[PDB]
Amino acid sequence: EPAVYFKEQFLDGDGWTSRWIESKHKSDFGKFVLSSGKFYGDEEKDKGLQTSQDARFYALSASFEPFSNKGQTLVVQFTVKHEQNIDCGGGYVKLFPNSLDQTDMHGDSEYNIMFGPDICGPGTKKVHVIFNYKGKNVLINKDIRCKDDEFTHLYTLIVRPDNTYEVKIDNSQVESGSLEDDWDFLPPKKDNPEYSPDPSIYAYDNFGVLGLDLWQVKSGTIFDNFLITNDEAYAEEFGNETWGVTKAAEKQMKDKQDEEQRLKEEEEDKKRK
Amino acid sequence: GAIIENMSTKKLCIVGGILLVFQIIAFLVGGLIAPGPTTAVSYMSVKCVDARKNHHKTKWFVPWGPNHCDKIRDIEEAIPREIEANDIVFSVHIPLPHMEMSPWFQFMLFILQLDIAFKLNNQIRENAEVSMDVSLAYRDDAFAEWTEMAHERVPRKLKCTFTSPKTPEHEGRYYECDVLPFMEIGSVAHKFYLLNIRLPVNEKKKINVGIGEIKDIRLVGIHQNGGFTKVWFAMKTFLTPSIFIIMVWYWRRITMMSRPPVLLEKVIFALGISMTFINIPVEWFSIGFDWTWMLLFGDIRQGIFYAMLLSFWIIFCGEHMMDQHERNHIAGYWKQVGPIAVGSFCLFIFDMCERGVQLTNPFYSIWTTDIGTELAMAFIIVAGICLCLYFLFLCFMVFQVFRNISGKQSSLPAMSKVRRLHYEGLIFRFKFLMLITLACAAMTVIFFIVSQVTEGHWKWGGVTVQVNSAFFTGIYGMWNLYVFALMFLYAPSHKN
Amino acid sequence: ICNKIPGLAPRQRAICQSRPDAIIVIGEGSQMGLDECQFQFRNGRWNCSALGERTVFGKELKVGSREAAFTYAIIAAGVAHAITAACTQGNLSDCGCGWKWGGCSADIRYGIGFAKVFVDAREIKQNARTLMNLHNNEAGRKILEENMKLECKCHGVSGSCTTKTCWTTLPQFRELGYVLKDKYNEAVHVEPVRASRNKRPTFLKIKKPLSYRKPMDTDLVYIEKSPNYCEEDPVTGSVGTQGRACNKTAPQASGCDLMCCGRGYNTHQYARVWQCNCKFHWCCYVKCNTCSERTEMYTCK
Ligand SMILES: *[C@@H]1O[C@H](CO)[C@@H](O[C@@H]2O[C@H](CO)[C@@H](O[C@@H]3O[C@H](CO)[C@@H](O)[C@H](O[C@H]4O[C@H](CO)[C@@H](O)[C@H](O)[C@@H]4O[C@H]4O[C@H](CO)[C@@H](O)[C@H](O)[C@@H]4O[C@H]4O[C@H](CO)[C@@H](O)[C@H](O[C@H]5O[C@H](CO)[C@@H](O)[C@H](O)[C@H]5O)[C@@H]4O)[C@@H]3O)[C@H](O)[C@H]2NC(C)=O)[C@H](O)[C@H]1NC(C)=O
Ligand SMILES: [Ca+2]
């Protein structure tokens, strides 16, 4: 059964102000806005939270029904569109237990899982998969290259009781493996006297908060179509039913806008001479 | 008629020469003999460690010498030792090793400087405030116990800025923080002082959270030099009998006339009283008694003299209006003396709110809060407005007196000889006193500016001259001689 | 105690007998200067670490280039700074102070005087190199003097500026290190001049073209051309960049092409620990979480 731990589409027009709480740890945190962007596939189905102020930190979260993934597959899914093509800026989402105070969130809040693309300079264009395990915020060993263009891209993380995991981008597989292989959770096997197996890595006692905690020099990115669920299937169908259906219209819309801009540029070059 | 109308030019020149000689001597006493007004000594606090010894009984941590505290060289060592906050007590011993404080240091003024290191994830908040848990003690001999003098919480707002780019390449550099006014005591009756400062941390109550990464606490102790105090007391000891003698002479001159004194003579006597109140060295009792209120008392004495001088100038100008004026009733001068009264009252209230409260709490400062700053600025602004009104009134009255004089000069030949001499003497009185007062005020202002801009002393030949102290001695002697000359030259003359 | 201390000149070892307490402070000052020099040049091919053996003042540089000038100036400034700073907190008693008449002289004067009489005694042999080191030491002490932060407080009648007191406080040594780094970036080439009657040079003048005057007392000078510093050669005092870290990018003097002088990079999966996500008190409370990451750092071949 589709145990929907969290889900949002912002079809109500003002639900983001009601379900998402703006943090007040620091005075100069940037403000999200609900906008469809300059270009989109659907005017209201693709209206999401947009960063609006340059060179600002951002801190905003929504609480949901607490749950535990012990003995159950966990799936997190969301979509990002980078209307400004950041040279530096995050696009990842953080998951917190319900003990977190949503008004005091900042860059140093203790999250359970951090997932999503991160960009800063040409050097780093990777997808973060960080697990807070026994006081260690272990980063993923394998390097997953994230998308860069203005088009909307879907990101999905799957964690399974058998310690296996996979990362889905644009409803397509990009990475797979196991928790104990691709992270430095346990001491190395070599038999090392310090070694001891621990299959309970994947399990968290409670998830109760999803948050957006990121720094952006160039504002303009839009987040949409969040999902936290136990079912990989419902994740895949949901991603097809929001990103896939709007993909064609959004692509045609960008193509038309770029054609108009190119026509304007070439006619301006002709008339200037 | 005064003395000065009668005096020939030769006697006036003799008096002026004697006064100039005494003025030069007054300048030289401070320039050559005095060692400089104040001494500032900078103390680096020793980061003592409370190894959970001060649980109930109050304990004193000594920076150095016998019974020296367990201390940290640099505050990073507290992490491997797992020494939490609320245990690091910054301790200062006010007399540096092998030195003693003495009552001849007429006061102790302390400021605080914080060395706050810039760290990217430990920056100072937008409205950070540090609340020091200060404790201060005194001791008379090195083998006795410390006795608690004060124990207060001292909140101060941080005004720190960081100039370098906020990048890890420039991490660890200190914030540029303005100095924090710490405390002031009007008496130094004891020899040794111990100062203990703690910065307790409490996230729930927001005590000392977000004040940055404080590395060192640096204390600066300002006191008046003992040599300057001794020179000052010798000067006052010379001046007190002189002013007393001239006061008694002037009182006898006034009262044994065949007529009651006019208002101007009473105002001159009041100015003499106001200066005699300064000249009496009651501060020479502060070297035997613990009178912490001597700073406020001296400030009130100085303010009384300033108010009486400013009042005397306007009364003199009013009393030298040649035509249809010079009524000997003080009530007619409420318009022009009023600004002096209002400004003096406002400054007195401000001084009571700043130095008067510090008698009960040395670490108090009116500026620690926004409301206190607003109140103090209100009093200071009212005083400044009153001063501007007073100077406008004084300029108008001087112009009017000169207009009246210029209108009088044409009609002099038609008058009788006695009235001619009377009016000529009044004109000479006014012109002489106005020129002398302008010279004294100009020299006072010029030397004040010079002492403010000059580094403090000048080296010429085989001697060094203390300009910042020659200023004090020269101006003090200057106004004592001004009062003496005013009280002698403008005393009534007796006909024969 | 200076019997054990290596590298000290015989006259300096007598100053140890005069002030056994101050020699520890002077050693701390020399080490502070060397630490600041190592920090400022950490990204250069000369990381201020030709010191393969330990002496109080650090191993002397065989070539009197800009690097030697910066080293000498920072060492002298550090010695003076440490003497003054240790005096301010009561670690030295005879420093400064008489007290009840004039209240002692300024601390920085004692610090500078003692640092001068100690450090400048190290230049035993008379030579153009000795002139260069003396000039650099005086430049460092002068730069320390120029950077003293002046402060004043008015405490007159009602607190007005009728009376005020001023004092100078030491600049924290990282600021002085950056100032001397800026001086190093613009040091002037100088040349000794010898009088026939004197048979030995006594002063030096600028070698840079379109100039013939004596260099100013607050300007670092050098008399020899700087080596390459990336091939090890004890004839020229070069340590080499073999095995030194590199960022492997375009920025100057830190990219792996320039740092290794074309020898290429070498990577080994360094796998950092990276303590992060902390909640801080002002000095001493940490509860961070270590965000370990298998990062790569590149070393010169
Ligand atoms: C080799 O030479 C090249 C050539 O020049 C150099 O490459 C340069 O690299 C620097 C460093 O990135 C680039 O400077 C950047 O310039 C931007 C525009 O001027 C700045 O915005 C940017 O500032 C970021 O970095 C500095 C220093 O790292 C930080 O002080 C600053 O706060 C910014 O940090 C955030 O930037 C990104 C925003 O998305 C994040 O990816 C980054 O991790 C950091 O995020 C922090 O803050 C967020 C906000 O809440 C937190 O969520 C983060 O924590 C989370 O993520 C971390 C892991 O990332 C987890 O551990 C944690 O659990 C999570 O909570 C962070 O706390 C820079 O100043 C410069 O442009 C480059 N020049 C080029 C490419 O030419 C460089 O010298 C060398 N390069 C290398 C790779 O060595
Ligand atoms: Ca939407």
PDB file of N, CA and C in Angstrom, chain B residues 48 59-64 90-95 134-139 146-147 149-150 192-196:
ATOM      1  N   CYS B  48      42.573  32.062  34.008  1.00  0.00           N
ATOM      2  CA  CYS B  48      42.609  31.064  35.066  1.00  0.00           C
ATOM      3  C   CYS B  48      41.551  29.996  34.823  1.00  0.00           C
ATOM      4  N   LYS B  59      35.833  31.974  45.730  1.00  0.00           N
ATOM      5  CA  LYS B  59      37.269  31.783  45.601  1.00  0.00           C
ATOM      6  C   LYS B  59      37.852  32.862  44.702  1.00  0.00           C
ATOM      7  N   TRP B  60      39.075  33.282  45.011  1.00  0.00           N
ATOM      8  CA  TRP B  60      39.763  34.326  44.265  1.00  0.00           C
ATOM      9  C   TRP B  60      40.924  33.704  43.499  1.00  0.00           C
ATOM     10  N   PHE B  61      41.011  34.005  42.207  1.00  0.00           N
ATOM     11  CA  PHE B  61      42.055  33.474  41.343  1.00  0.00           C
ATOM     12  C   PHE B  61      43.092  34.563  41.094  1.00  0.00           C
ATOM     13  N   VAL B  62      44.338  34.283  41.445  1.00  0.00           N
ATOM     14  CA  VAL B  62      45.423  35.260  41.383  1.00  0.00           C
ATOM     15  C   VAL B  62      46.232  35.006  40.116  1.00  0.00           C
ATOM     16  N   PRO B  63      46.436  36.013  39.262  1.00  0.00           N
ATOM     17  CA  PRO B  63      47.140  35.767  37.991  1.00  0.00           C
ATOM     18  C   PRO B  63      48.556  35.246  38.152  1.00  0.00           C
ATOM     19  N   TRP B  64      49.290  35.715  39.158  1.00  0.00           N
ATOM     20  CA  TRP B  64      50.708  35.399  39.267  1.00  0.00           C
ATOM     21  C   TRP B  64      51.149  35.541  40.715  1.00  0.00           C
ATOM     22  N   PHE B  90      38.774  35.186  33.822  1.00  0.00           N
ATOM     23  CA  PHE B  90      39.827  36.126  33.471  1.00  0.00           C
ATOM     24  C   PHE B  90      40.184  36.965  34.689  1.00  0.00           C
ATOM     25  N   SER B  91      41.437  36.881  35.118  1.00  0.00           N
ATOM     26  CA  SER B  91      41.869  37.499  36.360  1.00  0.00           C
ATOM     27  C   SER B  91      42.945  38.535  36.085  1.00  0.00           C
ATOM     28  N   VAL B  92      42.787  39.708  36.691  1.00  0.00           N
ATOM     29  CA  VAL B  92      43.734  40.808  36.562  1.00  0.00           C
ATOM     30  C   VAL B  92      44.110  41.282  37.958  1.00  0.00           C
ATOM     31  N   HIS B  93      45.400  41.503  38.179  1.00  0.00           N
ATOM     32  CA  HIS B  93      45.906  42.082  39.416  1.00  0.00           C
ATOM     33  C   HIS B  93      46.383  43.491  39.093  1.00  0.00           C
ATOM     34  N   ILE B  94      45.684  44.488  39.627  1.00  0.00           N
ATOM     35  CA  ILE B  94      45.739  45.856  39.111  1.00  0.00           C
ATOM     36  C   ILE B  94      47.134  46.471  39.214  1.00  0.00           C
ATOM     37  N   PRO B  95      47.862  46.353  40.324  1.00  0.00           N
ATOM     38  CA  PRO B  95      49.266  46.777  40.291  1.00  0.00           C
ATOM     39  C   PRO B  95      50.145  45.675  39.715  1.00  0.00           C
ATOM     40  N   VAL B 134      31.428  40.020  36.817  1.00  0.00           N
ATOM     41  CA  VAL B 134      32.625  40.645  37.370  1.00  0.00           C
ATOM     42  C   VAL B 134      32.625  40.542  38.889  1.00  0.00           C
ATOM     43  N   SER B 135      33.815  40.352  39.457  1.00  0.00           N
ATOM     44  CA  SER B 135      34.036  40.379  40.894  1.00  0.00           C
ATOM     45  C   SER B 135      35.356  41.082  41.164  1.00  0.00           C
ATOM     46  N   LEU B 136      35.349  42.018  42.110  1.00  0.00           N
ATOM     47  CA  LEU B 136      36.500  42.870  42.379  1.00  0.00           C
ATOM     48  C   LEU B 136      36.830  42.843  43.863  1.00  0.00           C
ATOM     49  N   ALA B 137      38.120  42.772  44.179  1.00  0.00           N
ATOM     50  CA  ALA B 137      38.583  42.683  45.555  1.00  0.00           C
ATOM     51  C   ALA B 137      39.727  43.657  45.786  1.00  0.00           C
ATOM     52  N   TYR B 138      40.058  43.860  47.058  1.00  0.00           N
ATOM     53  CA  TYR B 138      41.151  44.735  47.455  1.00  0.00           C
ATOM     54  C   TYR B 138      41.961  44.076  48.561  1.00  0.00           C
ATOM     55  N   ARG B 139      43.209  44.513  48.690  1.00  0.00           N
ATOM     56  CA  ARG B 139      44.107  43.980  49.700  1.00  0.00           C
ATOM     57  C   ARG B 139      45.169  45.023  50.006  1.00  0.00           C
ATOM     58  N   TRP B 146      41.948  38.267  50.478  1.00  0.00           N
ATOM     59  CA  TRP B 146      41.269  39.223  49.616  1.00  0.00           C
ATOM     60  C   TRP B 146      39.898  39.560  50.186  1.00  0.00           C
ATOM     61  N   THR B 147      39.530  40.835  50.109  1.00  0.00           N
ATOM     62  CA  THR B 147      38.245  41.313  50.602  1.00  0.00           C
ATOM     63  C   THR B 147      37.413  41.811  49.430  1.00  0.00           C
ATOM     64  N   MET B 149      35.151  43.847  47.201  1.00  0.00           N
ATOM     65  CA  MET B 149      34.711  45.233  47.112  1.00  0.00           C
ATOM     66  C   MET B 149      33.385  45.357  46.372  1.00  0.00           C
ATOM     67  N   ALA B 150      33.254  44.671  45.242  1.00  0.00           N
ATOM     68  CA  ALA B 150      32.045  44.740  44.438  1.00  0.00           C
ATOM     69  C   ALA B 150      31.842  43.403  43.745  1.00  0.00           C
ATOM     70  N   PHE B 192      46.452  46.968  46.608  1.00  0.00           N
ATOM     71  CA  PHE B 192      46.340  45.929  45.596  1.00  0.00           C
ATOM     72  C   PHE B 192      44.876  45.635  45.320  1.00  0.00           C
ATOM     73  N   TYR B 193      44.546  45.458  44.043  1.00  0.00           N
ATOM     74  CA  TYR B 193      43.194  45.143  43.612  1.00  0.00           C
ATOM     75  C   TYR B 193      43.220  43.918  42.711  1.00  0.00           C
ATOM     76  N   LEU B 194      42.258  43.024  42.906  1.00  0.00           N
ATOM     77  CA  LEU B 194      42.126  41.816  42.102  1.00  0.00           C
ATOM     78  C   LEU B 194      40.781  41.835  41.397  1.00  0.00           C
ATOM     79  N   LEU B 195      40.792  41.575  40.097  1.00  0.00           N
ATOM     80  CA  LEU B 195      39.593  41.617  39.275  1.00  0.00           C
ATOM     81  C   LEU B 195      39.375  40.257  38.629  1.00  0.00           C
ATOM     82  N   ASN B 196      38.189  39.686  38.827  1.00  0.00           N
ATOM     83  CA  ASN B 196      37.838  38.393  38.258  1.00  0.00           C
ATOM     84  C   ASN B 196      36.607  38.541  37.381  1.00  0.00           C
TER      85      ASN B 196
END
